[PDB]
Write a protein that binds this ligand. Structure first.
Ligand SMILES: Cc1cc2nc3c(=O)[nH]c(=O)nc-3n(C[C@H](O)[C@H](O)[C@H](O)COP(=O)(O)OP(=O)(O)OC[C@H]3O[C@@H](n4cnc5c(N)ncnc54)[C@H](O)[C@@H]3O)c2cc1C
Ligand SMILES: [Zn+2]
Ligand SMILES: [Zn+2]
Ligand SMILES: [Zn+2]
Lengths: 12, 737, 26
């Protein structure tokens, strides 16, 4: 669920 | 009995019992069965029975623990778990620099952070000369962990008090255990709505699995260490968090503690690179660099010294990476620009508000600086020209209708593609007319004017007249978790944070970049006066408008895809006026509210000073600030500052018609629109556009040219925070190389 | 974006609220 993900830890 | 271990593949050629709990303990001899905890740790069948069997003396101790472990945990209380949690001897590493040997503590000693912090061999001959137990080396074999039966569970984790809602053993802590800035909420709580910059304590993030695949099967050890690291950072964000500081806070029995200590450094550096810890305005100098020498060989040119450029520069510098910042203007800050000339108050010509302080980098940086923010109250009366405060029922009636219009827009857009996009303003209008048609209801002129206020407030938010903004995508970013909590006035101004970020960096002012050439071995950067710079990598953080104007010559040229995205966003604009007075003439009517609204006489004038801000939360000084948005930005482009001031004063004398208003004694009017190297306030999605545009603009080119800035942050567009975070993002990308 | 609003925030047009339901929760 993309909504919740931490911004700095989803940059793949 | 036997001398062999149960576990298949165990290299223990001589099992010995660590427990010695039974008066019948086998020690180094024969036993019916050796129970395996790790390659270096076993306990004999006698000591097993000592706790496991009801008729044995250690059964009480095992049943009591088994009960606590039930009212507290989600893992099964096995004897092996009891052993690893309760009986396994602790290990601690000698702190003498030239020794650093790991030592087993006697079974009665309970390891504490203070003991670990100062421990040396022998602490109850040259004790440091005694050979290290051969079992210690084994721990650093990758298969060592694979033959660990149960994962480590930390004791008295600094993270524990922040996680009382989770089963301790689900977040890497032991069920048998047990004044932070209110804005620090790093961990999601169970059953919480999304909020920005939160991590799940019990699940690894995508980038984490990417970096540490070996934990996909069992993330227990990682989560415990990551959670501990974050807790420690937020416990004290004014110092670099180092492995040395973490190690004493890693408390777990057994040789596994050695493996935990060995992992903490890897995780620390990953957390640092990504910008989760050791960040903000923290400064670190030569021989204090936050990343190993392995990252240091490289160089970077950063273009632009606003929040984004300075964020990346601060990060990279602290990392030990060679960085030069080129700024076009005679000052750093960009859209952060504070006027400190007003009596007893700091007034931003640009940004000054913090939208959602919880987990906000800005809130962290205020903590680091010992700065206090002012939380806005809710009240904002809608005052009419001239004098009348809007009836509470009229106020509620039109708020309801305004937001109802937004609901149906959000409903209309569900099945529309970019190719069918229509302007938000037009859509709202149509829906409004078609509603008055449908239902015979008719609103008064005032009710219509109040609706105009709300429309104006949308235009302020987007930095554009609503007939330019996308109905489909105006609020695109809310698809992602946003910053929760207080909105505040940064009373000291963003400039204090800016100064602090830039302090001691290599920054070249009055150096407008004109050419960027990344066709050769390294990037050639040339300024407008022909001065040459070169580096391995380049980061551009110039405002959207400047990218749209094509003020920088790229070779090779930016892709057509990028250009489409760049042009699909709007260079939004607002201007500010600040006014100083002899006394606080508004106190009687306004009654301490942080701001007051201005009901528009007409749709055309709606963005002309819609909200007035009291710029002294201490209610002592007399400075008002207001904004010019939407259509009114245009109407002011040919007016000089004095003329704008005249219209603002005319407005105030209307709003406060039944009283006198003193003359202002000092003021400013901003002209961001015509600042050559900026030309805007903040981005928005133009009709036809998508939020994905932010991602496309953000995309590096060949790992050589990188982009940051508020117009590159899809999650958090527009803001200083968003710009700051885009810089941290790019610093991480650049440092990885 | 809506998130830029401090005074008199708009509320309409928001997508439904999602709520994390983890198992690690007591
Ligand atoms: C009036 C106003 C009110 C605002 N209100 C708020 C607010 O309340 N809260 C909030 O969070 N944000 C607010 N913002 C927005 C916020 O200031 C910006 O989002 C943020 O500053 C953008 O960051 P930046 O780093 O990306 O770019 P910038 O701040 O825009 O800085 C970019 C830098 O690039 C430089 N540059 C441009 N071209 C070149 C070149 N060719 N060579 C070298 N350098 C170049 C510019 O000089 C500038 O120094 C406001 C902005 C304005 C103008
Ligand atoms: Zn034994
Ligand atoms: Zn074994
Ligand atoms: Zn020693």
């Amino acid at each position: 669920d993309p909504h919740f993900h931490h911004f700095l830890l989803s940059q793949t | 009995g036997s001398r062999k271990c149960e576990k298949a593949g165990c290299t223990a050629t001589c099992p010995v019992c660590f427990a010695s709990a039974s008066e019948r303990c086998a020690k180094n001899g024969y036993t019916s069965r050796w129970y395996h905890l790790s390659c270096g740790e076993h306990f004999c069948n006698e000591c097993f029975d000592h706790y496991y069997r009801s008729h044995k003396d250690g059964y009480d101790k095992y049943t009591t623990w088994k009960k606590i472990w039930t009212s507290n945990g989600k893992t099964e209380p096995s004897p092996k778990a009891f052993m690893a949690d309760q009986q396994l001897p602790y290990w601690v590493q000698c702190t003498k620099p030239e020794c650093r040997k790991w030592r087993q503590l006697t079974k009665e000693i309970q390891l504490t952070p203070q003991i670990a912090k100062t421990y040396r061999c022998g602490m109850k001959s040259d004790h440091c000369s005694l050979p290290e137990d051969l079992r210690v080396l084994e721990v650093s074999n990758h298969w060592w962990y694979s033959m660990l039966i149960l994962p480590p569970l930390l004791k008295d984790s600094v993270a524990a008090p922040l996680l009382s809602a989770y089963y301790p053993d689900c977040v890497g802590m032991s069920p048998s255990c047990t004044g932070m800035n209110r804005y620090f909420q790093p961990f999601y709580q169970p059953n919480e709505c999304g909020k920005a910059l939160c991590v799940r304590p019990d699940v690894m993030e995508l980038d984490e699995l990417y970096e540490f695949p070996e934990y996909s099967r069992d993330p227990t050890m990682y989560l415990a260490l990551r959670n501990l690291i974050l807790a420690l950072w937020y416990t004290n964000c004014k110092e670099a968090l180092t492995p040395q500081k973490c190690i004493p806070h890693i408390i777990v029995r057994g040789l596994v503690r050695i493996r935990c200590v060995q992992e903490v450094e890897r995780i620390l550096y990953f957390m640092t690179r990504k910008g989760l810890i050791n960040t903000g305005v923290l400064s670190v100098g030569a021989d204090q660099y936050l990343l190993p020498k392995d990252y240091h060989n490289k160089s970077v040119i950063i273009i632009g010294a606003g929040p984004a450029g300075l964020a990346a520069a601060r990060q990279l510098h602290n990392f030990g990476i060679k960085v030069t910042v080129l700024e076009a203007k005679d000052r750093i800050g960009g859209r952060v620009w504070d006027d400190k000339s007003f009596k007893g108050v700091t007034v931003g010509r640009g940004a000054q508000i913090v939208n959602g302080c919880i987990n906000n980098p800005v809130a962290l940086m205020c903590e680091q600086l010992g700065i206090s923010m002012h939380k806005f109250g809710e009240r904002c009366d809608l005052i009419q020209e001239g004098g009348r405060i809007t009836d509470p029922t009229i106020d509620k009636r039109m708020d309801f209708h305004f937001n109802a219009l937004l609901d149906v827009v959000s409903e209309w857009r569900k099945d529309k593609t970019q190719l069918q996009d229509v302007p938000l303003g037009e859509k709202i209008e149509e829906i409004y007319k078609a509603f008055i048609k449908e239902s015979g209801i008719q609103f008064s002129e005032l009710e219509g004017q109040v609706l105009q206020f709300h429309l104006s407030n949308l235009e302020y938010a987007c930095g554009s007249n609503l007939h330019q903004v996308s109905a489909r995508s105006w609020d695109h970013n809310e698809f992602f978790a946003q910053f929760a909590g207080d909105h505040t006035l940064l009373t000291p101004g963003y400039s204090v944070i800016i100064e602090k970020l830039a302090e001691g960096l290599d920054i070249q002012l009055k150096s407008p970049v004109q050419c960027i050439d990344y066709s050769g071995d390294e990037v050639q950067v040339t300024t407008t006066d022909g001065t040459g710079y070169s580096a391995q990598k380049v980061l551009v953080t110039v405002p959207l408008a400047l990218l749209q104007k094509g003020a920088i010559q790229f070779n090779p040229p930016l892709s057509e895809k990028k250009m489409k995205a760049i042009n699909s966003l709007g260079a939004g604009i607002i201007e500010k006026i600040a006014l100083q007075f002899p006394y606080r003439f508004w106190d009687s009517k306004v009654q301490g509210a942080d701001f007051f609204g201005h009901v528009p006489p007409s749709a055309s004038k709606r963005g002309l000073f819609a909200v007035f801000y009291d710029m002294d939360p201490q209610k002592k000084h007399s400075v008002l600030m207001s904004v010019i948005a939407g259509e009114a930005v245009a109407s002011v482009r040919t007016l000089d500052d004095k003329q704008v001031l005249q219209q603002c004063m005319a407005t105030l004398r209307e709003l406060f018609k039944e009283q006198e208003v003193p003359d202002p004694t000092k003021y400013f009017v901003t002209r961001w629109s015509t600042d050559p190297w900026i030309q805007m306030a903040y981005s928005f999605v133009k009709t036809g556009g998508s939020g994905e545009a932010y991602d496309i603009i953000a995309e590096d080119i060949q790992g050589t040219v990188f982009f940051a800035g508020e117009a590159t942050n899809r999650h958090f567009p527009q803001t200083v925070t968003g710009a700051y975070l885009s810089g941290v993002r790019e610093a991480s990308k650049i440092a990885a190389f | 974006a809506r998130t830029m609003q401090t005074a008199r925030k708009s509320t309409g047009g928001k997508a439904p609220r999602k709520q994390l339901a983890t198992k690690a929760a007591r």
